[PDB]
Structures are given as structure tokens and as C-alpha cells.
């Protein structure tokens, strides 16, 4: 086509979606990771994770307001990944990289799994 | 912080939100612009438009599944802006620029209003 494109649009949209999350505006699901609860927007989770895409495209699960993750999932790892979904920034540290990578494999977030593998390989 | 950032994340999120819109997945509002109907995600509309942000933060309007726009709004202008919200690309043409600018002023999409003003000024 003959369209023009606003370079910062996608980043500005994501920043606003994170502001809605902060302010608990139109959040429509609670993700439970053992004793912790995380509120989020189903559409953002589906856009970022192959696991959430499969969950919320299921005719029965799409209607659930609470999703319980596998008890082996670390809440801090999930929190770091949820922040990445809404900001593009990943708080990867020596002390959390194994939990983050395991969580990203479970959530099916291939780009995160890729950078974790690379950072682990560099330390070996 | 000491975060790393995935450059293409925001663009990939927006591309996936547009794929959900295409496939009518988790759309939760119908915007009526005279005889036409447009299905969308309330969160994407709020992230892009000052008018939708004000509508869906209102304690009564946040619960509506149908929103009727002012009868003076042109459906093609709205369609072009809805596509911009989900893609960052604006299909601006000599034949639609006045309707697009009027619609962007009503929707409170300041960056679009800015480029329309500039393209109009260049033709004068």
C-alpha cells in the first residue's frame, strides 16, 4: 500500500497497556502461581505467550477469570516475564536466570528462551 | 535498572493483537459509526485514543458492549484510524485526509491530527 507509519506507535501502545495494568483498568484475568496472584489483560498474555494463546483460544478456558499455573513455576520468574510482556524489558540476573528460562519455556516465549540460553552459554 | 530490551517486542505484540482482531478473538466491543459496525478490543482503543480512554474509564460506560459514535463521523475515516491503531500504518490519501483528520480530532489521536495538518499545509 501507500501508507505512512508512525515509528513510536507500537511502543506507545504497549506503554499505555502497562499504565492500564498498573491502574488495574480492564484487567480480566488473575494468573495464580502458587501463593501469588497476578492481574493482567488476556489479550496481552495471548500476544506474548504460546501457552496463553492456546488457553484463551480454547472454547471453555477463554471464559475463565482465574488460571492456575503448574506448581513448579516460580512466582518471581513469572513476575519478571509479565513485566517483560508489558514493557519489552527483561530483568535477567545471575540469581533468576534459571527460573526465568524455565518459566519462558513453560509459557512458550521463544525470544526470551533464546536470550537465556545465550547468557547461560557465555557463563560456561 | 539493569534490564535488557527486545527491540521488536512492541511491534510483535501489536501484530499479534491485530491477528486476534482479524480472527475476532476476545473482541469485547462494537463501535457503531452510523450504518457500519467495527469490532475491537477496548484496551487497544483506550491505548490509542483519548476519547476511548475517557469512555472506558467511566464507571458506567466501561460495561457497555456497544458504543455509538457521533453521526457526523465518517465510517471510512474511522476504519482507517482503527487499522492505524492496530498496525501503526495510516492510509492517508487526498480523498480521505479531511475525514481522517476530523475523525482523529474527535477520537483525540494527537499524532494523527499532527501529520494530517502537515500534509494539508504542504498542499496549500
Amino acid at each position: 500500500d501507500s501508507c505512512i507509519q508512525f515509528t513510536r506507535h507500537a511502543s506507545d501502545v504497549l506503554l499505555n497497556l502497562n499504565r492500564l495494568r498498573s491502574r488495574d483498568i480492564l484487567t480480566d484475568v488473575v494468573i495464580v502461581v502458587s501463593r501469588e496472584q497476578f492481574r493482567a489483560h488476556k489479550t496481552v498474555l495471548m500476544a506474548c505467550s504460546g501457552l496463553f494463546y492456546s488457553i484463551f483460544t480454547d472454547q471453555l478456558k477463554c471464559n475463565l477469570s482465574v488460571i492456575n499455573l503448574d506448581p513448579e513455576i516460580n512466582p518471581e520468574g513469572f513476575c519478571i516475564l509479565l513485566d517483560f510482556m508489558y514493557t519489552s524489558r527483561l530483568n535477567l540476573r545471575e540469581g533468576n536466570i534459571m527460573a526465568v528460562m524455565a518459566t519462558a519455556m513453560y509459557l512458550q516465549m521463544e525470544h526470551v528462551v533464546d536470550t537465556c540460553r545465550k547468557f547461560i552459554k557465555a557463563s560456561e | 535498572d539493569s534490564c535488557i530490551q527486545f527491540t521488536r517486542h512492541a511491534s510483535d505484540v501489536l501484530l499479534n493483537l491485530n491477528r486476534l482482531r482479524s480472527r475476532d478473538i476476545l473482541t469485547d466491543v462494537v463501535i457503531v459509526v452510523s450504518r457500519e459496525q467495527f469490532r475491537a478490543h477496548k484496551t487497544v482503543l483506550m491505548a490509542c485514543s483519548g476519547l476511548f480512554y475517557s469512555i472506558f474509564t467511566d464507571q458506567l460506560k466501561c460495561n457497555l458492549s456497544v458504543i455509538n459514535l457521533d453521526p457526523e463521523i465518517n465510517p471510512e475515516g474511522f476504519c482507517i484510524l482503527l487499522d492505524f491503531m492496530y498496525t501503526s500504518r495510516l492510509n492517508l490519501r487526498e480523498g480521505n485526509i479531511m475525514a481522517v483528520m476530523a475523525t482523529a480530532m474527535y477520537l483525540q489521536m494527537e499524532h494523527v491530527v499532527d501529520t494530517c495538518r502537515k500534509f494539508i499545509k504542504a498542499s496549500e
Binding site: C3, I4, Q5, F6, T7 | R89, L90, T115
Partner: peptide
């Protein structure tokens, strides 16, 4: 704004 750019030409994509």
C-alpha cells in the same frame, strides 16, 4: 512518521 516514515515511509515503511
Amino acid at each position: 512518521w516514515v515511509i515503511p
